[PDB]
Amino acid sequence: VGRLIYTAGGYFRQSLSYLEAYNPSDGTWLRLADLQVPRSGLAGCVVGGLLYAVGGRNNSPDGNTDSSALDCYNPMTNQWSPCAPMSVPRNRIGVGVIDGHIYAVGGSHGCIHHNSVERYEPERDEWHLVAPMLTRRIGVGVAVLNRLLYAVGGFDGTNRLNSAECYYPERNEWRMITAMNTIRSGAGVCVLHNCIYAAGGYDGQDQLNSVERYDVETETWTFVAPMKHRRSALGITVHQGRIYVLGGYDGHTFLDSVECYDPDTDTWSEVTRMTSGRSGVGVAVT
Numbered sequence: 603v604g605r606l607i608y609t610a611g612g613y614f615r616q617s618l619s620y621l622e623a624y625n626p627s628d629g630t631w632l633r634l635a636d637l638q639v640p641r642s643g644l645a646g647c648v649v650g651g652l653l654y655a656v657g658g659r660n661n662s663p664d665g666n667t668d669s670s671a672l673d674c675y676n677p678m679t680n681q682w683s684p685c686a687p688m689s690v691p692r693n694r695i696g697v698g699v700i701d702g703h704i705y706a707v708g709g710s711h712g713c714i715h716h717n718s719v720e721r722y723e724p725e726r727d728e729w730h731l732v733a734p735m736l737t738r739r740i741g742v743g744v745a746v747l748n749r750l751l752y753a754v755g756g757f758d759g760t761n762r763l764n765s766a767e768c769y770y771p772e773r774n775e776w777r778m779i780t781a782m783n784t785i786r787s788g789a790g791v792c793v794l795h796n797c798i799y800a801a802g803g804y805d806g807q808d809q810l811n812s813v814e815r816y817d818v819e820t821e822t823w824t825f826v827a828p829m830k831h832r833r834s835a836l837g838i839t840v841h842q843g844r845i846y847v848l849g850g851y852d853g854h855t856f857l858d859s860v861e862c863y864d865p866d867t868d869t870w871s872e873v874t875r876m877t878s879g880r881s882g883v884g885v886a887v888t
């Protein structure tokens with residue numbers, strides 16, 4: 603009884619360790635087991651009903667280090683269990699899942715701007731690297747469609763990117779797709795109805811509120827209704843046919859308003875507010 607939206611970690615004056623869940627049907631908010639380590643800039647995904655916390659940059663009383671950690675949360679036990687860590691720390695990471703395999707895309711290790719991606723086999727609890735991206739990307743958004751991994755926007759070390767690349771697992775290669783109309787760093791990327799949505803983000807001069815979706819059929823970026831709040835480093839997921847944007851940062855305050863986008867109406871609604879404003883959260887639904 604209840605498929606939930608999960609928010610894990612985040613930042614607000616100090617990277618948080620909170621794990622909270624939102625039930626859209628009734629609007630309730632749930633406080634669950636906190637992360638063993640406060641983390642922000644991490645990404646979230648679910649494989650086999652299990653929630654995974656990947657990457658980010660964790661708080662410590664002995665430093666503020668880029669985390670290569672992979673942690674697994676079981677809603678049934680409300681208990682976090684650490685898994686095998688990634689080869690290298692990845693902060694500002696994008697993660698996409700293909701057949702129960704977790705793809706870690708880009709991310710930063712201090713000044714190192716990763717272009718390498720590694721995949722995780724949950725059953726073996728092992729990470730193995732694959733082909734690296736054509737471009738270095740941190741703050742990149744990752745989305746999987748028809749068993750294809752799309753990495754969009756980000757920062758390559760000197761430029762904020764509007765380009766996107768596509769990973770073909772069968773060929774194990776990266777192909778550059780038509781770039782977005784807008785440069786987006788720390789934007790929200792998700793898939794809905796054969797379309798990759800890029801929501802919000804940072805273009806280099808100001809946090810964005812516009813949203814443009816990429817139509818796989820045409821392979822072209824088209825603008826849709828923009829969001830009511832400008833946000834960057836936002837959490838994003840789709841839940842029962844609607845896109846959900848969680849929190850983010852507008853350039854002034856750490857936001858918490860959650861906005862819902864309806865494809866059929868092409869309108870944004872503020873469905874709820876979170877317990878506390880936060881940014882750089884990982885988001886997943888299960």
Ligand SMILES: COc1ccc(S(=O)(=O)N(CC(N)=O)c2ccc(N(CC(N)=O)S(=O)(=O)c3ccc(N)cc3)c3ccccc23)cc1
Pocket residue numbers: 612613614642643644658659693694695740741742756757786787788789803804834835851853881882
């Ligand atoms: C110091 O103030 C803070 C503002 C936000 C946070 S945060 O917790 O949200 N956070 C986590 C972390 N730092 O690891 C993040 C911060 C910035 C990001 N960008 C980098 C990129 N595009 O490469 S950004 O483009 O969104 C951007 C650029 C400039 C401004 N002014 C704001 C945002 C992130 C991208 C992805 C994930 C997390 C990000 C913490 C402190």
